[PDB]
Design a protein around this ligand. Sequence first.
Ligand SMILES: Nc1ncnc2c1ncn2[C@@H]1O[C@H](COP(=O)(O)OP(=O)(O)O)[C@@H](O)[C@H]1O
Ligand SMILES: [Mg+2]
Lengths: 77, 371, 55, 55
Amino acid sequence: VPPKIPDGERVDFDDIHRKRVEKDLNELQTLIEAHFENRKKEEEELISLKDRIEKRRAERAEQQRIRNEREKERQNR
Amino acid sequence: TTALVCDNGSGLVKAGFAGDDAPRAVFPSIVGRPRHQGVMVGMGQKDSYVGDEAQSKRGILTLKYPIEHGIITNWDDMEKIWHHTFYNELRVAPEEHPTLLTEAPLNPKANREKMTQIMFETFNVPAMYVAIQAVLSLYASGRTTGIVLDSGDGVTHNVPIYEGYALPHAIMRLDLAGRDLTDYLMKILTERGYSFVTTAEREIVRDIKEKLCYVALDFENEMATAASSSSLEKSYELPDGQVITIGNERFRCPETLFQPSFIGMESAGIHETTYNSIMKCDIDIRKDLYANNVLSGGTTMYPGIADRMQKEITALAPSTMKIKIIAPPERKYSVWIGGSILASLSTFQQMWISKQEYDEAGPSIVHRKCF
Amino acid sequence: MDAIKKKMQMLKLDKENALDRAEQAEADKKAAEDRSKQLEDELVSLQKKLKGTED
Amino acid sequence: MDAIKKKMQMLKLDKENALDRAEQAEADKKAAEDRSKQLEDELVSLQKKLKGTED
Ligand SMILES: Nc1ncnc2c1ncn2[C@@H]1O[C@H](COP(=O)(O)OP(=O)(O)O)[C@@H](O)[C@H]1O
Ligand SMILES: [Mg+2]
């Protein structure tokens, strides 16, 4: 014979609130917080660091030009 | 203690402890032995990579799914998959946790009996229970009525339920699912020049299907539009470059669901087997089933299917009834969420198949009262 | 991105629920008004029958 | 950007439209229901006076 489920009390369709409404606001707020903190940590620091590395690169370029010119001056024979 | 809600599925094994929102570990169910020779010594090369590890070394493996259509065809590989799931993806010994497997409707008995025998002898669980994959998807929606179309990756089945009383004479199980759509897409891609043959490249075609294909609202108009303009051609970059451009293959692959004559299957589409499943029900519960049609399973995630199906059923159904299609955003894990809810219930706590009961009646206990 | 999709989904859930409620209320109005007008017609026929009885 | 604004505004407009339509329908439903109740109450007395007339 097919199984017979013993009779209980309750409930159903009442956990949809407690599993939906929670993340309906908490998840949105938490993801907004994550996006804000990630953008703040990432974008400005990356642009500033790239500018810093660019300045160091320009200084390296000047040093390379000076050394190349002085060596070409001496070695030119 | 807590229960383990495993869900074998066919294509993705989803598991996790009972009482959460999402499965803890989701990974493809493939076991791939290496096929080449291997010359480096001491590299630590194993004999079989299972789960998500074989989706990264798939270049030199021969992946083979252990579950063909719901049924399990290779028991050793399935045992290996279960062992991996328990020990490495969850890291909980099964000696201290009840398990709740899931099984498609109308499956062979021997499959279910072997499943319970394995769970009780090899892994030695305290108690396990097998549940039909559609009732859980109905749990997750928070309903108690409705006809659920659970189009997985192995098999598409359509179980109608009213007021908690399932109708066993109205279950329409059809064996077209995501895998056949992958094969058909791989077969129609050859019309542009792209040939995928290896069992590893089936995964690439699956990714193409997931990311690009969509279900057309009206098939003939889309076929006419894609043949004149070029606003549909979306490109995609293979795992090595050489981008490809998919034209009207986009909506022709998932159209097979509504016209199974494309892959040579005789039966009617998923739009008409639902109506037939409804019409087999009694005359007084057809309105409720019309109003509470539920979608589940992975393959029902195509963009634009919840409108095509509603249009088709509204065409078939009487003009007065209201047709509503419930398509929750968490469709893929709907069965597992329902499984977690069912395992977390207090009323259900005495339905498990306790080990002493199995010792007294053998593996055939599953067909008995403890269903 | 990520949060934007979820916010859109929330805005769509509100859409579906509001639209469904509107349609259901409209059906309720149609049914209730049909009930009222049929009752009024029954009242009219009763008035006419009373008139015949008075004659 | 551009798409987010227009889509969000259109969806909020859809929600508001459905809500106000539902409220109008429910108001008309309540009014029709009360008028129907009045019709019932008057019809009962019409039947009573008809019965006396027939006697
Ligand atoms: N986002 C998606 N879009 C289209 N198809 C998908 C998507 N995700 C998964 N699929 C299809 O669904 C299958 C996974 O289905 P799933 O529900 O995991 O099956 P099972 O019932 O065995 O768990 C995949 O093989 C894939 O073909
Ligand atoms: Mg499934």
